[PDB]
Amino acid sequence: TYTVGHYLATRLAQIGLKHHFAVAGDYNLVLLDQLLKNKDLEQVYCCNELNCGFSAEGYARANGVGAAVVTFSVGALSAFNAIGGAYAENLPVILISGAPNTNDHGSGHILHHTIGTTDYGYQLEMAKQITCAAVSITHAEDAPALIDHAIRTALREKKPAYIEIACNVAAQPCARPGPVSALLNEPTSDEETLKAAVEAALDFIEKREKPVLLVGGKLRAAGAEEAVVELADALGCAVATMAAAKSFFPEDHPGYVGTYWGEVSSPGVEEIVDWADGIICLGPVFNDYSTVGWTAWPKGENVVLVDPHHITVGGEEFTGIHLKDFLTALTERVPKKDATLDAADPNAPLTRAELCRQIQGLLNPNTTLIAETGDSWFNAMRMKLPHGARVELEMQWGHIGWSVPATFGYAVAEPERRNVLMVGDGSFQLTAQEVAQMVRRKLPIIIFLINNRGYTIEVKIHDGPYNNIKNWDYAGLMEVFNAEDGKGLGLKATTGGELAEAIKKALAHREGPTLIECVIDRDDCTPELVTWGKKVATANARPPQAI
Ligand SMILES: Cc1ncc(C[n+]2csc(CCOP(=O)(O)OP(=O)(O)O)c2C)c(N)n1
Ligand SMILES: [Mg+2]
């Protein structure tokens, strides 16, 4: 006879999860036992919850959805930082927490892992704030209807959910899951709006000769990566990707120019959009960083904005549509308008140009490049990508240290890929211990620890003593985690040559991860980050305007 544990386990497996991540605790202990009972759904463990949640973050980038489990408040409050990151990056990460007993609710008791107050709702009062759905199971009869809700909403919205489950309830007997289809099927557009939406879009381009395509960050949540390719071709115009959305459009196809990111756009892409007649943004995320100090933000007269569920065209609005259904019906009536555009030395000290070049050697169609918040953002946005090659940024949320646990998670879902991690010295320190799990699971990850002895990106926004961080022997950390049983390489590289030696050892090494402490100079950095931090620093601290 099924139980709340089984029902949640199965519901996760049905929608996709081969792995759910967890951190033991006396509330979720009984619950965790029953999450094992499903054998198509494996219980991965983690060092702390802040990371555990970020690992489910990554996993959802590869699978499409992820999940985690934690103890009451003490575990979940840290995870909320990842659930914020999920909502930010449109990831259907499903958090789950253990919770007090049923007989303690409103019972005047104080419990452990809580504030000391007699109330325990404060947790999912918080969670609600950062999650599309928030659900407390306190009776096993409720269970299956609410779990379905939490999952169903998360997937429709492409935003995270929350499920707290009283420890003693987790065990109790529950119903059997209904067919999975109950959760997945979605409301589609309305034909009448859809019809008109396309018609007004056609006029936007057919009163012009030089259109452009701009690929937004939210494209992956809409599931429209395919339909953009069939539009870029059927239309033929010059495509460009945004700050995010790197590797959301393939860099083979003839229209792809590069990356548009304001006055720090990769060579030759700022000009095409400025010059052109109108811009077709497909689910963008313009903000103080994406617009680069509010300088590079498309208007409305010469802009079509095709956000996930609501489409603005010059002088008109539409709602109740979908980005995908819009780009399917568009890629048929669209006419073909075009806007055509027209080594280093080894042995010597290692330059940011050298390893950004040499790292581009690794880029296999079976490769996913995880670029951490930092200057590493700008390196990835210069690198040419093969077809099928992926890049993962976390720009909306930007928690440093996200990369490490999210690389661990991404790798559990896609272990046969070549998983490559560009992480700075400072970011790495926040979440380093989750490398020990890459060793535990024996995953072939290639960590490029961009060591520069400081928060270099933060230096070029506004410098100070707060940016100088204690330095580690980042290379030697690997050994400490390998300890008795693991197998994982820990290397260094102070020269352009040493890098090639380390990279060969990395591709060579199996049975675990490979870190490379690529030392470089702080002020040696991309020319974008230089001119970029200025726009952010002044916009950040622009003065109020008196009334
Ligand atoms: C948890 C968290 N704390 C602080 C910040 C602000 N912040 C953004 S980047 C950054 C510095 C990153 O340092 P590092 O990885 O070394 O960047 P690099 O020097 O490689 O460019 C800081 C402190 C943040 N985004 N997240
Ligand atoms: Mg650094």
Side-chain angles (χ1 to χ4, degrees):
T1 42
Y2 263 54
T3 80
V4 190
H6 314 179
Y7 191 102
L8 194 216
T10 47
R11 270 332 201 186
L12 295 170
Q14 291 161 15
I15 60 173
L17 269 38
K18 283 286 187 190
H19 306 85
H20 78 285
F21 304 74
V23 167
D26 57 334
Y27 290 124
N28 70 8
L29 234 46
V30 294
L31 166 54
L32 282 169
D33 277 328
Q34 302 199 330
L35 286 156
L36 294 159
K37 275 172 152 62
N38 187 291
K39 318 281 194 183
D40 301 322
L41 178 270
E42 194 191 324
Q43 193 169 113
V44 187
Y45 307 117
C46 288
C47 302
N48 63 64
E49 299 84 357
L50 207 172
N51 303 358
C52 187
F54 271 125
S55 301
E57 213 260 38
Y59 196 84
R61 308 211 166 205
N63 180 290
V65 17
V69 180
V70 288
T71 321
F72 191 48
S73 71
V74 146
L77 284 168
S78 309
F80 291 165
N81 204 336
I83 304 306
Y87 208 120
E89 306 290 334
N90 301 74
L91 290 190
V93 177
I94 297 164
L95 181 60
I96 294 103
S97 174
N101 193 266
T102 315
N103 305 282
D104 286 318
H105 264 270
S107 308
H109 291 142
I110 305 174
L111 289 162
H112 80 114
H113 294 169
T114 161
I115 294 160
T117 53
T118 54
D119 182 77
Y120 329 126
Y122 70 82
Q123 198 188 231
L124 88 147
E125 270 295 328
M126 281 153 131
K128 267 196 231 161
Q129 210 82 50
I130 61 169
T131 200
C132 78
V135 166
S136 176
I137 313 307
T138 177
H139 306 106
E141 316 97 82
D142 288 338
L146 296 75
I147 299 153
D148 280 42
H149 174 62
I151 294 150
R152 185 197 307 146
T153 308
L155 299 167
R156 217 179 56 248
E157 296 291 334
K158 295 296 197 295
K159 317 276 199 175
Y162 168 92
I163 308 167
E164 96 176 35
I165 306 179
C167 43
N168 64 317
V169 171
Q172 293 183 320
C174 159
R176 183 160 279 97
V180 195
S181 307
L183 310 180
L184 284 309
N185 62 322
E186 284 168 342
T188 52
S189 310
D190 156 50
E191 292 102 312
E192 307 174 34
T193 9
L194 178 58
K195 166 194 166 62
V198 178
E199 298 217 55
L202 289 160
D203 254 86
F204 184 91
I205 57 169
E206 284 175 13
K207 292 161 172 176
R208 297 169 198 267
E209 197 173 44
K210 295 274 214 157
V212 201
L213 254 170
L214 190 49
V215 181
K218 302 190 163 178
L219 185 70
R220 189 155 71 167
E225 293 186 80
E226 305 97 310
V228 176
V229 172
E230 299 186 50
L231 193 268
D233 301 338
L235 178 55
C237 62
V239 178
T241 55
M242 280 228 69
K246 178 62 168 185
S247 84
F248 277 25
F249 192 89
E251 314 198 341
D252 308 45
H253 280 70
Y256 186 71
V257 194
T259 266
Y260 171 75
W261 191 4
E263 66 184 301
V264 296
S265 294
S266 62
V269 191
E270 188 182 29
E271 296 74 8
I272 193 81
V273 301
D274 294 20
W275 195 103
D277 311 7
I279 302 150
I280 314 302
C281 312
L282 303 181
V285 191
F286 301 116
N287 51 31
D288 55 332
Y289 282 52
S290 236
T291 59
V292 88
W294 305 116
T295 74
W297 189 4
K299 210 149 172 283
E301 297 151 51
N302 306 342
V303 182
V304 178
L305 230 92
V306 194
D307 262 282
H309 314 299
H310 115 78
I311 303 169
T312 70
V313 304
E316 230 166 330
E317 269 231 29
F318 300 96
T319 76
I321 1 288
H322 283 84
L323 173 53
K324 198 205 297 188
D325 295 11
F326 174 78
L327 296 176
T328 296
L330 179 67
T331 56
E332 296 177 331
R333 307 240 267 148
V334 65
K336 193 174 190 153
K337 299 203 170 270
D338 184 298
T340 152
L341 88 78
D342 284 322
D345 165 75
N347 190 273
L350 183 52
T351 57
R352 299 226 188 182
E354 173 60 5
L355 86 162
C356 176
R357 184 191 68 83
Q358 219 175 124
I359 289 164
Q360 205 188 126
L362 286 156
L363 310 186
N364 197 38
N366 209 42
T367 304
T368 285
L369 177 60
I370 294 174
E372 177 59 291
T373 307
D375 181 68
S376 320
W377 275 351
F378 305 94
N379 298 123
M381 298 271 272
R382 291 138 72 91
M383 290 183 195
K384 167 70 185 184
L385 290 164
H387 197 110
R390 302 300 307 184
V391 180
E392 299 303 332
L393 306 154
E394 194 207 28
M395 280 196 161
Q396 185 51 70
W397 198 245
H399 192 283
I400 62 161
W402 149 78
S403 66
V404 171
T407 301
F408 174 60
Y410 194 109
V412 169
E414 303 278 300
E416 104 297 348
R417 291 190 78 83
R418 195 188 301 182
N419 291 318
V420 196
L421 162 53
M422 272 205 291
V423 53
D425 55 315
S427 296
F428 186 83
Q429 284 201 2
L430 280 84
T431 55
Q433 56 268 84
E434 222 60 17
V435 169
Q437 299 292 319
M438 306 172 189
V439 174
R440 193 185 203 172
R441 310 274 300 180
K442 306 188 170 173
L443 298 170
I445 297 157
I446 303 165
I447 303 175
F448 281 97
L449 192 285
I450 308 293
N451 183 0
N452 49 49
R453 272 176 218 81
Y455 298 149
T456 305
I457 176 158
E458 293 287 322
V459 166
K460 315 213 173 186
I461 297 170
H462 194 73
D463 186 45
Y466 36 64
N467 293 335
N468 308 324
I469 58 135
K470 174 84 174 74
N471 199 71
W472 300 354
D473 182 23
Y474 300 100
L477 189 67
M478 276 290 339
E479 282 285 275
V480 176
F481 297 155
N482 274 284
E484 50 178 299
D485 26 358
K487 298 169 199 163
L489 283 178
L491 316 172
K492 186 161 179 177
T494 62
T495 68
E498 266 181 295
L499 179 51
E501 294 195 66
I503 286 165
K504 241 170 66 185
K505 278 289 282 293
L507 293 166
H509 185 58
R510 270 79 190 190
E511 213 67 7
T514 308
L515 181 138
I516 308 170
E517 183 187 336
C518 315
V519 166
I520 43 167
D521 203 74
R522 174 191 284 193
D523 300 319
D524 180 24
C525 83
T526 54
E528 301 104 89
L529 170 56
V530 173
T531 61
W532 178 89
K534 294 164 195 165
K535 307 292 147 180
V536 168
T538 56
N540 269 342
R542 71 186 188 278
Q545 291 161 306
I547 308 164

